[PDB]
Structures are given as C-alpha cells and as structure tokens.
C-alpha cells in the first residue's frame, strides 16, 4: 500500500539482478553477466521499457526474467498507484 | 486530475531531457547527447514504448531514466485516465 508494494519490488529487483548473473554466466554470449547492469536490466523489465539494452539467453535466465515481470509489473501496477493517489491529492489541494 | 497530472509529466519530460544530456555527455559512446532527441527519448520512456531508439549508458543517465519512468508512468497512468473518462463520456452521449 503505502511503501509496502514499493519494498517488495526492490526485493524482486535485487534478487532478480543477482540470480540473472548466476543463470546467464556459462552461456557463451550473454551480456547479462555483471551485477551492475544485471540490476539495470531488471528495472527495464519491471517497468516494461523494453529498451533492448540487455536480455537473457539461457532458459533459467528467461525464468528469472519472467518472475521479474510478474513481481515487478504487479508492484509497479501498485507503486504507481501510490504515487498517483498521493501526488494528485497533494497537488490538487 | 483535469490537466494537472498532464502538466507534471511535461516537467518530467523537459527536466529529464535536459539532465540526460548533462549526464551522458563525457561518456564515450552515448547517443543521448542533443536536447532534441534527449526529449524524444524521455517520451519513449514515460510511455513504455521501448522502441530501442536511444538509451543511457552512464550511471547517472540511468538514474535520470528511472525518474522519468516513475514520474512518467505515474503521470501517464493518470493522463490516460483523464482522456479515457473525458472521451468515453463525450462519445457515449
């Protein structure tokens, strides 16, 4: 609600970034192999920005990726809910 | 509400475009370095079109980018609210 769905998204974005590097390392080609850009990749994902920066190529990386979308889009289908309500009320008064 | 979340998005899209050029200049490679396409980049972002046109490569550019998504997606999770309500009412009557 308040800052609750917020926090859960950040669990997703870290645990996602972490496991993505674990899944993709060992697959000849993956660019998703350092914890920095692994984290930035999980934001593009949760937010559906699809910038085309990075993406997984292993099966298990795609699985991690799906979890981020689901758990991210849900969070972000709620984090923006919070911001929207909060700031429309504040700016309107 | 009316044209309120609208205006805030345009603050985001300008201040975003501006700061993106400031962040990315100096990083050997960034295409996000003139104020025109810096502005168009912040629309692709707020709207999640992920066309793959431009994107940041510095850390600080990615930060600016996140702020655009959050403050944009929120606005745009509300600007389309406005249009939807407004025009469904008008067209229905």
């Amino acid at each position, epitope marked *: 609600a308040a800052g609750a769905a917020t926090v859960l998204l950040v669990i997703v974005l870290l645990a996602g970034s*972490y496991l993505a*590097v*674990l899944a*993709e*390392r*060992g*697959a*000849p*080609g*993956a*660019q998703l*192999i*350092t*914890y*920095p850009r692994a984290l930035w990749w999980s934001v593009e994902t949760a937010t559906t920005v699809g910038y085309g920066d990075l993406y997984p190529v292993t099966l298990w990386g795609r699985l991690v990726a799906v979890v981020v979308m689901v758990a991210g889009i849900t969070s972000f289908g709620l984090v923006t809910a919070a911001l929207a309500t909060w700031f429309v009320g504040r700016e309107q008064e | 509400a009316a044209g309120a979340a609208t205006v805030l998005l345009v603050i985001v899209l300008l201040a975003g475009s501006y700061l993106a050029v400031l962040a990315e200049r100096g*990083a*050997p*490679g960034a295409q996000l370095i003139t104020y025109p396409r810096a502005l168009w980049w912040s629309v692709e972002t707020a709207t999640t079109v992920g066309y793959g046109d431009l994107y940041p*490569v510095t850390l600080w550019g990615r930060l600016v980018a996140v702020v655009v998504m959050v403050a944009g997606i929120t606005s745009f999770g509300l600007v389309t609210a406005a249009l939807a309500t407004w025009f469904v009412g008008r067209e229905q009557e």
Partner: antibody
Amino acid sequence: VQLQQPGAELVKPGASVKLSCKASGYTFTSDWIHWVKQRPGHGLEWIGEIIPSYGRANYNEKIQKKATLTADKSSSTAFMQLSSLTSEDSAVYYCARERGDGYFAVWGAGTTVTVSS
Amino acid sequence: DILLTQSPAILSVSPGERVSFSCRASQSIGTDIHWYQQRTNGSPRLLIKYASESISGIPSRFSGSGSGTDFTLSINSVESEDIANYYCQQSNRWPFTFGSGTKLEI
C-alpha cells in the same frame, strides 16, 4: 597478500592435482573466484570461474575441460582439480578476485605446475 | 567468444615519450575493456578499468581511452619502471577473454 596460493607443484604425467587459494580480506557473498593459466612465454588463458558462496562454477568452453572447481565456504579457501595431466598442462596458475563487476582487482601469486616423472 | 587483438606485438620507444597500445575487439563491447600490467616474474596488475576509469594506486601516467571496438592504453611519458607485458580483457559477453598482449621495449 590478499589472494594466497602455494608456490610450486609437481605431478606425475596422468596423475591428478588439487590447487588451493586462501583469500584473507573480505569474503563477500557476491565475490567470484577465477583461475587463469599462463603457459611459459604465452599470454593469459581464462580457464574457469566459481562463485564460492552460492556454489556454482563455469568452465572454458574451448579448452579440453580437464578441471573442476570447488570451495570451502567457512574456510575462505577455493580449489581447482586438474585431472590426468600431460606436459601440455605445465604452466603458472593464478586465482583472481572478480567482485562481480567484471575485472580481476586482486591476483594471487601464481602456482607453478610441472608435469614430469 | 570475443576476440581481443592487440597490435603491435612489441613497442619500441625512447624514455619520457608518449606511447599507446591499441586493442581492437571483434565486435562492439562498449566500454567493458580493462587493462593489466604484468612485469617479468610477477602476477598481473589491474591498470585501467572500464576502458577509461583509473585505479587508486596507479601512476597518473596511464590514461584509458577508447570505446566500441577501438581501445587505447596510453602512458603520458615513459620511464624504465614501466617495462612489462600489457593485457586487455573484455567483460561484455561470456566468457571473459584476454588479448594476446603487448610488451614495451625502451
């Protein structure tokens, strides 16, 4: 001395050998340990990486995969097992400390392996 | 497997002068190159990370340049303590790879 590995080894041809790497300093969850091989008068040959905490390892596709990586989580020491060697396999063997960001900040002293009877 | 290609192999130069080892990738890797120095008998030693950023404890002589597929280690001056082999190593795509290496002669 951050990454600390033995001085020299001798292996009968066809025999196996284990290689150690004790790492004082930090011991981060996210640390990776790599192993690079330097044949005499050559360049650096990345062999394989291991993340000790979580436990998975990945080896170099291209080379004859003679080796296998392990670690001891609560001793801060990691291992590489080279199985059945020739004299093509005589070289210096470093371990490196990649933080997870993609470069080998910390290097071991190297272990000289000489495969001979 | 990305191919780093350091030309030339050896690099003659007179002391105090600027010097530049090119490294040229086999496809774009952005800025994910890193440079290493390895003198005679000693282990390698990180010089420049992420193609430009410096390392705390490295002489300011070393200057990281380049992006894409053209990269350049530069030493603004040269002194005798700088004779070594110099290696590059990409982190953009798995596996991490190394260059063939360049030795510096004076």
